[PDB]
Design an enzyme around this catalytic site. Structure first.
Site, PDB file in Angstrom:
ATOM      1  N   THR A   1       0.820  -1.205   0.000  1.00  0.00           N
ATOM      2  CA  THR A   1       0.000   0.000   0.000  1.00  0.00           C
ATOM      3  C   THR A   1       0.857   1.259   0.000  1.00  0.00           C
ATOM      4  OG1 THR A   1      -1.780  -1.174   1.139  1.00  0.00           O
ATOM      5  CG2 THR A   1      -1.821   1.231   1.219  1.00  0.00           C
TER       6      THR A   1
ATOM      7  N   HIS B   1      -2.294  -2.893  17.036  1.00  0.00           N
ATOM      8  CA  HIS B   1      -3.058  -1.873  16.324  1.00  0.00           C
ATOM      9  C   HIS B   1      -3.850  -1.011  17.297  1.00  0.00           C
ATOM     10  CE1 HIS B   1      -2.967  -4.032  12.169  1.00  0.00           C
ATOM     11  NE2 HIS B   1      -2.098  -3.039  12.204  1.00  0.00           N
TER      12      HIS B   1
ATOM     13  N   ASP C   1      15.579   3.656  10.549  1.00  0.00           N
ATOM     14  CA  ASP C   1      14.590   2.753  11.117  1.00  0.00           C
ATOM     15  C   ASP C   1      13.563   3.542  11.915  1.00  0.00           C
ATOM     16  OD1 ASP C   1      13.410   0.215  11.907  1.00  0.00           O
ATOM     17  OD2 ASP C   1      14.359   0.536  13.862  1.00  0.00           O
ATOM     18  N   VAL C   2      12.295   3.136  11.801  1.00  0.00           N
ATOM     19  CA  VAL C   2      11.219   3.840  12.489  1.00  0.00           C
ATOM     20  C   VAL C   2      11.306   3.671  14.002  1.00  0.00           C
ATOM     21  CG1 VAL C   2       9.527   1.969  12.448  1.00  0.00           C
ATOM     22  CG2 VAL C   2       8.753   4.359  12.335  1.00  0.00           C
TER      23      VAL C   2
ATOM     24  N   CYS D   1      -7.438  12.610   2.580  1.00  0.00           N
ATOM     25  CA  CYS D   1      -7.499  13.117   3.945  1.00  0.00           C
ATOM     26  C   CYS D   1      -6.537  14.270   4.191  1.00  0.00           C
ATOM     27  CB  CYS D   1      -7.214  11.988   4.935  1.00  0.00           C
ATOM     28  SG  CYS D   1      -8.433  10.658   4.903  1.00  0.00           S
TER      29      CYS D   1
ATOM     30  N   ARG E   1      14.509   1.496   5.178  1.00  0.00           N
ATOM     31  CA  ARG E   1      15.669   0.751   5.652  1.00  0.00           C
ATOM     32  C   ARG E   1      16.747   0.656   4.581  1.00  0.00           C
ATOM     33  NH1 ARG E   1      15.322  -2.753   9.746  1.00  0.00           N
ATOM     34  NH2 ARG E   1      17.586  -2.487   9.539  1.00  0.00           N
TER      35      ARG E   1
ATOM     36  N   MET F   1       4.705  -1.395  15.847  1.00  0.00           N
ATOM     37  CA  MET F   1       3.800  -0.379  15.322  1.00  0.00           C
ATOM     38  C   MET F   1       3.459   0.662  16.379  1.00  0.00           C
ATOM     39  SD  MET F   1       1.221  -2.684  13.005  1.00  0.00           S
ATOM     40  CE  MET F   1       0.728  -3.649  14.429  1.00  0.00           C
TER      41      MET F   1
ATOM     42  N   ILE G   1      -7.505  -5.726   2.130  1.00  0.00           N
ATOM     43  CA  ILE G   1      -6.829  -4.899   1.137  1.00  0.00           C
ATOM     44  C   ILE G   1      -6.456  -5.800  -0.032  1.00  0.00           C
ATOM     45  CG2 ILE G   1      -4.965  -3.278   0.699  1.00  0.00           C
ATOM     46  CD1 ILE G   1      -4.824  -2.830   3.735  1.00  0.00           C
TER      47      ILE G   1
ATOM     48  N   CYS H   1      -3.074   4.195   9.204  1.00  0.00           N
ATOM     49  CA  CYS H   1      -3.865   3.035   8.818  1.00  0.00           C
ATOM     50  C   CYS H   1      -3.703   1.948   9.872  1.00  0.00           C
ATOM     51  CB  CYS H   1      -3.427   2.529   7.445  1.00  0.00           C
ATOM     52  SG  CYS H   1      -4.406   1.172   6.804  1.00  0.00           S
TER      53      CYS H   1
END
Ligand code: NA
Length: 205
Positions: free
Chosen positions: A14, A131, A53-54, A187, A34, A86, A153, A108
């Site tokens: 996505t 989540h 990296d997040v 959005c 990455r 996450m 999805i 998301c």
């Protein structure tokens, strides 16, 4: 006017179509990846690439700096194990947005957050738990947060004729990855979904 956006998770299925549509829409896109080779070599390339990296607070901080809005498409690389990547990734993004004064975040999660918690399949409960933690992190941040909670999805084409259900479940159980990225960019042009949960769905068959 939102012009500079950052996309987290742009290398996913996505994320790649969201990045492609955002570049074509005229946005100045910054991505955190990455590996720079995971981005498409031809066609829509982002304006700025941060390699990191997040889960590194400093890498997220330099990605969010100077942006008008943030798109979050974090996943668990097809791993159903209990994780916090996450939720902890969301905490780094929120911390960076507060420091730099960025207010708009489109993130998301999953339509399971709109289900009866007892009806969620037990095999998917571990991923759904993270989540929920990420959603609570973004909900309690006080930012302009659009909660995108899509159903299945799929690989259907881009239509733009999907249905957007606010704060509830929609009539269809499938959304295409292209329409999902299309809606998350929509959005950025309006605030009418701020503070709401959105359920995009469409009937392709
Ligand atoms: Na990546």
């Amino acid at each position: 006017a939102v012009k500079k956006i950052a996309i987290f998770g742009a290398t996913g299925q996505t994320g790649l179509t969201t990045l492609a549509q955002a570049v074509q829409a005229g946005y100045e896109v910054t991505v955190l990846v990455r590996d720079s080779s995971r981005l498409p070599s031809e066609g829509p390339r982002p304006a700025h690439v941060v390699v990191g990296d997040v889960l590194q607070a400093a890498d997220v901080d330099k990605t969010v700096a100077g942006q008008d809005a943030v798109i979050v498409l974090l996943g668990t690389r097809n791993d159903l194990s209990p994780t916090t990547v996450m939720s902890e990734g969301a905490r780094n993004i929120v911390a960076a947005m507060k420091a730099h004064g960025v207010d708009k975040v489109v993130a998301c999660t999953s339509a399971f957050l709109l289900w009866d918690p007892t009806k969620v399949p037990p095999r998917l409960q571990a991923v759904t738990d993270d989540h929920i933690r990420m959603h609570k992190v973004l909900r309690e941040s006080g930012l302009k947060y659009v909660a995108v909670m899509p159903p299945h999805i799929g690989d259907q084409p881009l239509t733009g004729a999907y249905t957007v259900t606010l704060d509830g479940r929609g009539p269809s159980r499938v959304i295409s990855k292209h329409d999902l990225g299309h809606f998350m960019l929509r959005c950025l042009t309006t605030d009418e979904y701020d503070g709401h949960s959105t359920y995009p769905s469409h009937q392709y068959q």
